[PDB]
C-alpha cells in the first residue's frame with residue numbers, strides 16, 4: 851500500500867503539472883495516469899480545454915488547506931526530473947477530479963505505476979457517458 855506525504859503548494863503550472871515543496875525541496879510534479887490538454891508546447895498549440903484544465907487544477911490546489919502527494923510503486927521521476935504522483939487536495943485526488951470532470955484522459959500507464967488505474971478508468975467512462983468537456 852501507498853502512503854500520502856504532506857507537501858506545500860509553490861505554484862500550479864497547468865492542468866497536470868504543479869510545483870510543490872516536498873521534504874523541504876522545490877520539485878515539479880506530473881500527475882500520474884492522466885493527460886490534460888496542452889497549453890505551452892508550440893507542437894500542439896493551446897489545445898481545447900487546456901485553459902479549463904489548468905484553471906481547474908489551480909483552483910483545486912490553491913484553495914486547499916492540505917496538499918498530499920502519494921508516490922506509486924514504480925519509478926518516481928520521469929526523464930525530465932518531474933515527480934510522478936497522485937496529488938490530493940483536502941483528501942480529494944486531483945488526478946481523479948480532472949478525469950471525472952472530463953478535463954483529462956487516462957494516459958501513460960507507465961513503468962509499474964498503475965495502482966489507481968481502474969479507479970480512474972471508471973471515472974473516465976462516467977465523464978464519457980455524460981459527454982462532459984473533452985467528451986462533448
Ligand SMILES: Cc1cn([C@H]2C[C@H](OP(=O)(O)O)[C@@H](COP(=O)(O)O)O2)c(=O)[nH]c1=O
Nearest residue numbers: 880881882883884885928929934958960963
Ligand atoms: C504521466 C507520465 C508522463 N511521462 C512523460 C511521457 C511524455 O514524454 P515525452 O515528452 O517524450 O512525450 C511526457 C508527457 O507529459 P506531458 O503531458 O507533460 O507532456 O512525459 C512519463 O514519462 N511518465 C509518466 O507517468
Ligand SMILES: [Ca+2]
Nearest residue numbers: 866885886887
Ligand atoms: Ca499534458
